[PDB]
Write a protein that binds this ligand. Structure first.
Ligand SMILES: COc1ccc(S(=O)(=O)NC[C@@H](O)[C@H](Cc2ccccc2)[NH2+]Cc2cc(Cl)ccc2N2C=NNN2)cc1
Ligand code: NA
Lengths: 10, 251, 29
């Protein structure tokens, strides 16, 4: 559903 | 939001999405009150009956958003939480009395056309604007019916007389809550719904042309039911606590 | 309250009104 956010945030 | 409309770009620049890190999902709304503080509902972060008790590292906030699902490259900013503060007398056992929490960001968010803080009310602003029949505005990416919006939704709703709020529900209402929404005989409709909790109920002061957050989407029995109303945390009534936290723990 | 709080860059700052804010004003009787 949600577009991948940049992995830096995770 | 039920029976709302698509927000305009930059219409609610204090809007914050509370976003679970894994699984990656929308938890609640929230609001930006300074470059490092976000306001939301305590129940979005702490609700023991459902085994909900988030720590700082479980969560992100996404600020400056319009689209619900897309990563809004060059527009939204995503922030990590330094610290969560839940009101010490938040009543999760009974009726969500004092449903309020603050989140301090690890780093200040940069303001932009899409990111800008809302004001918190003074005593006089609350006394002037929190009147039955006066309309406020609710925004969120929650469900459209008791399904999900492509973009931020907006609905304007009238504040309701306290006896009418009390008589709509079996839940014990407190002075830290107010209710809002249209009556069955008013024809117009609208409500928050699932995913909207923690977001802002705002009013635009006709005295100084500024938006003030008067409420936080707190609880409601179903969404947009006839004879039922949304309940909102009374922000001014808890501003002493808000200021205490910010004064002690602000840099 | 913060100096510039509650004034939106794309609306109040530029003297543009959103599509439904008048409904709010009209209710402040
Ligand atoms: C402990 O206090 C309680 C008070 C009320 C209720 S309830 O009215 O039975 N349920 C409220 C619940 O649907 C939700 C708030 C909540 C979420 C998670 C844990 C505890 C409470 N209501 C959110 C909401 C707010 C508004 Cl203003 C309008 C609609 C809704 N809503 C209803 N369904 N989905 N969203 C439950 C416990
Ligand atoms: Na209703």
């Amino acid at each position: 559903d949600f577009e991948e956010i940049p992995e830096e945030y995770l | 939001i039920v029976e709302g409309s698509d927000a305009e770009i930059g219409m609610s620049p204090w809007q914050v999405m509370l976003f679970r890190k894994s699984p990656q999902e929308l938890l609640c709304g929230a609001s930006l009150i300074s470059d490092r503080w976000v306001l939301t509902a305590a129940h979005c972060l702490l609700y023991p009956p459902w085994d909900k008790n988030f720590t700082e590292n479980d969560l992100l906030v996404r600020i400056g958003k319009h689209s619900r699902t897309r990563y809004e490259r060059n527009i939204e900013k995503i922030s990590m939480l330094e610290k969560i503060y839940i009101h010490p007398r938040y009543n999760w056992r009974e009726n969500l009395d004092r449903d309020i929490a603050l989140m301090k960001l690890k780093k200040p968010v940069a303001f932009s056309d899409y990111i800008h803080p809302v004001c918190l009310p003074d005593r006089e602003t609350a006394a002037s604007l929190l009147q039955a029949g006066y309309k406020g505005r609710v925004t969120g990416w929650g469900n459209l019916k008791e399904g999900q919006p492509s973009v931020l939704q907006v609905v304007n709703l009238p504040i309701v007389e306290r006896p009418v709020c009390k008589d709509s529900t079996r839940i014990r209402i407190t002075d830290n809550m107010f209710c809002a929404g249209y009556k069955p005989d008013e024809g117009k409709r609208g409500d928050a719904c699932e995913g909207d909790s923690g977001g802002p109920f705002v009013m635009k002061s006709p005295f100084n042309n500024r938006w003030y957050q008067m409420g936080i989407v707190s609880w409601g029995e179903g969404c947009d039911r006839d004879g039922k109303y949304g309940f909102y945390t009374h922000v001014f009534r808890l501003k002493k606590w808000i200021q205490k936290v910010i004064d002690q723990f602000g840099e | 309250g913060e100096a510039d709080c509650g004034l939106r860059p794309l609306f109040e700052k530029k003297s543009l009104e959103d599509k439904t804010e008048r409904e709010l004003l009209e209710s402040y009787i």
